[PDB]
Symmetry: C3
Subunit: 107 residues, 3 copies
């Protein structure tokens, strides 16, 4: 099986279905929340919404580039928020699940 297929049909599907996915399914809406510093501090934004489109529209060079985007999504969240926030536990849980599913990856 292709790596990128797996990332779409398996890795991403699992994370998307998951309970805590909703804040990561579209980008952080800085106006709606009142956080003018978000686009200042977070240099390269990223969300599963974006990732899903990239898989569906032939953007990624290799599976290593799609994984990059996942880590950036997580690392972004951890930078901008203080540990033990609500959002951060959510991210942490998703990254747990994410990292499980990478290890099953085709080879």
């Amino acid at each position: 099986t292709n790596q990128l297929q797996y990332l779409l049909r398996v890795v991403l599907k699992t994370l998307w279905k998951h309970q805590f996915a909703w804040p990561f399914q579209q980008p952080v809406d800085a106006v709606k929340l009142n956080l003018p510093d978000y686009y200042k501090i977070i240099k390269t934004p990223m969300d599963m919404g974006t990732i899903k489109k990239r898989l569906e529209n032939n953007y990624y060079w290799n599976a290593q580039e799609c994984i990059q985007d996942f880590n950036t999504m997580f690392t972004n969240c951890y930078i901008y928020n203080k540990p033990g926030d609500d959002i951060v536990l959510m991210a942490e849980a998703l990254e747990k699940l994410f990292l499980q599913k990478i290890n099953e990856l085709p080879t």
Copy 2:
């Protein structure tokens, strides 16, 4: 790629046909007052969805796409009486599907 063939040849052929229109998007059970449709048919399918899936790198391979076309025809034959307009249209389209699927490459 056989998937290319299913998009560019098989699906265009079927979509362009006169009988396609009821199979180009889901059956809208609300509009038809068919509240039993979504309870009887458990995997609904249509060319709208199939098209989307080919355009968005969903399928594991050509043979999963063929499964979807079959599910489309057989859902029709499950829900509807034989000899109904809808069922004769489905049969027309399936005949034409089987012709086009024969000249499939082997990759």
Copy 3:
């Protein structure tokens, strides 16, 4: 690498950034601009928008089909408009650039 991937991430990216891209990012709206003859003279219309959808959705059989589309876009423009017209000077700059990027295509 796959050449289609190159056409998406490098060629089309570069052309779409460019200052003169905007009139070529969607079909030439003959009704808006008030050109009844455009669609009689131009038998195969084309634009960077349609090429993009096509790259994003697995439409192209191979990379030479995509390259023809880019060439149709320019020639259509030279056919329909007069020399010295602005749109032609724009397309000419875009074509220049297109041809540079095409000379670093994977093989």
